[PDB]
Symmetry: C2
């Protein structure tokens, strides 16, 4: 079967999802967490095939969590709840073996981060050695660019989201008003296919499974 | 002249340093900032040669700030106040053209981060193209390794610090008690050569330039 781990800060949503996945004998809910810390301690212990995830968490966010989980467990499949228009489409994706768009997105971003890091640290190594690595690095990140559709500002914002910085920390770092950041985050999540249904619509759906 | 920018959240320390560098006609204080954000807005506008910096700030920290400043301004020389046993040794280092240890520490970290990033994002490209890239990255990072003296945990902490995370966010992410983080940070800073004198001793030194 498919071992599924649930990550969501709402009991009501966790219980509804447990109900949903329970009716499918092919699925096996092997644990749940209501925050980034819990999931970081519990997911590598349960070793699921798939993590089912809300982007909104009390102590960070789901982009941060996915990046952090993926570096420790590279083959983990990550499905954002609001990336699907319904729980049925989500369940189909699970059965289909879908990895989740956020996975490709995180890796795209890490390839691009690597270009920046070497870029910033290049005054340490040989002149010709630096240009050689720099060339091969951009080539790899230019081949694999799932984030090509984003502006620079959105790439940066995504980067900072993936660190688990708060909206206020992001605002301070990007010289934006906090309200503008909240808007930009939602614009960015929408652009990445992660606002296909609202948070309140997930809640109303899981709550009716009670 | 050497253009110097001061970053410290205590007015008493900024004034004392302004007094001190003003006595030297070879130095030119070109600006001051009392936070990460202020420094981020103001250093790229003043384009100093040197930033004189205290590791503790109200909205982040100096490792974070050096990292962010250096990515936009690669040639900036960054000198942490507590990396020197006295203001005289620090002034000597400004005169000598010293870049400051934090600079190469940060570039070392970045190289090592690049290894982890490609490590993590490698399932996207060719199996063979991935390895070749991976070898060339490690070879470049272990050849240039100023952080070699640190433990893995200290490397991770240093990375998290450079993102400007609070001690609480670091505790959460590293599964440590907050007071343990405070001790590990102070330990890591001391190991990096950045606690050659205390904060209180810097404060008392600048205070006696005013009174």
């Amino acid at each position: 079967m498919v071992k599924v781990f649930l990550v969501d800060d709402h009991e009501v949503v966790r219980r509804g999802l447990v109900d949903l996945l329970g009716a499918d004998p092919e699925l096996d809910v092997v644990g749940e967490a209501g925050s980034v810390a819990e999931a970081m301690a519990r997911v590598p212990a349960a070793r699921p095939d798939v993590a089912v995830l809300d982007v909104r968490l009390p102590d960070g966010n789901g982009i941060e969590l996915c990046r952090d989980l993926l570096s420790r467990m590279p083959d983990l499949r990550c499905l954002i709840l609001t990336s699907y228009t319904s729980d049925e489409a989500m369940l189909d994706a699970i059965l289909a073996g879908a990895s989740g768009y956020v996975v490709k997105d995180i890796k795209g971003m890490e390839l691009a981060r690597a270009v920046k890091d070497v870029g910033a640290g290049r005054s340490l190594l040989d002149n010709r050695a630096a240009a050689a690595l720099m060339a091969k690095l951009r080539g790899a990140a230019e081949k694999q660019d799932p984030l090509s559709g984003l502006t620079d500002q959105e790439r940066t914002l995504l980067g900072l989201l993936s660190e688990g910085l708060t909206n206020k920390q992001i605002a301070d770092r990007m010289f934006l008003a906090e309200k503008t950041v909240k808007n930009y985050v939602s614009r960015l999540l929408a652009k990445l296919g992660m606002e296909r249904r609202t948070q309140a619509a997930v809640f109303a759906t899981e709550l009716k499974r009670s």
